[PDB]
Design a binder for this molecule. Structure first.
Ligand code: HEM
Length: 212
């Protein structure tokens, strides 16, 4: 009742583990659901995660920049875009001497699924849009810090930097999400919310690469 973004957040928080957040109701079943403080990332797995994340963000950001669909065009130039930052960070790993892997199935499958939804199901597409970006600025930063401390000697990658002030950029996007949702039917809103589990499933398989 605080606007549709609060409904999306309520549904998403319920899908965390208690090992992740106060409101979480999921059991800790997989290795990527362990408390971040207990994670043991490797640079090799982290690179696979960054490459597979880059494909997903490339897909999201290209869909939005090239679209004339007013729902999608509302989210051009949010300040949250990550594709170029990830390119810079993949460049930094190359100069440190690491070889950059090719995108694997978790990134390819998610990127492919997002294109299909962008063409056919805007309500579902928006749900993934919200969960991918707003996860990254929430638990994603906790993961990035833990990875930086343990294996990167506190390098702060561009992936975890924003050109404006993060909290205002997020609230601007929240307002735009509420704006597009007010032109949806209640069922369409409901379809968006029911999509959240799929977003955790696809994102969860990418996060797992950090630990593989
Ligand atoms: C290791 C994995 C994860 C951890 C440790 C984590 C942790 C957190 C934490 C601590 C918060 C903030 C809770 C609060 O301040 O009340 C949060 C918010 C959130 N998380 Fe996660 N999370 C993880 C994975 C995910 C995934 C896979 C998704 C979705 C694909 C997701 C979606 C969200 C969303 C949408 C929010 C709301 C952020 C906002 O309101 O701006 N999280 N998460």
């Amino acid at each position: 009742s605080k606007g549709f973004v609060e409904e999306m957040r309520f549904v998403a928080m319920r899908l965390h583990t208690k090992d992740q957040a106060k409101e979480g109701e999921k059991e800790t079943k997989s290795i990527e659901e362990r408390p971040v403080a207990k994670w043991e990332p490797t640079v090799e797995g982290y690179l696979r995660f960054l490459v597979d994340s880059k494909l997903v963000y490339d897909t999201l950001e290209l869909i939005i920049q090239d679209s004339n669909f007013p729902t999608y065009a509302e989210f051009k130039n949010t300040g949250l875009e990550r594709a170029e930052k990830l390119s810079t960070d993949l460049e930094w790993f190359k100069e440190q001497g690491y070889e950059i892997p090719e995108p694997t199935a978790p990134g390819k499958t998610y990127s492919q699924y997002l294109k299909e939804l962008a063409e056919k199901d805007p309500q579902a597409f928006i749900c993934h849009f919200y969960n991918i970006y707003f996860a990254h600025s929430a638990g994603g930063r906790m993961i990035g810090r833990k990875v930086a401390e343990r294996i990167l000697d506190n390098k702060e990658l561009e992936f975890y930097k924003w050109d404006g002030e993060l909290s205002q950029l997020l609230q601007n996007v929240r307002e735009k999400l509420n704006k597009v949702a007010e032109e949806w039917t209640r069922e369409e809103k409901n379809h968006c919310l029911e999509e959240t589990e799929k977003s955790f499933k696809y994102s969860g398989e990418i996060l797992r690469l950090i630990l593989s």
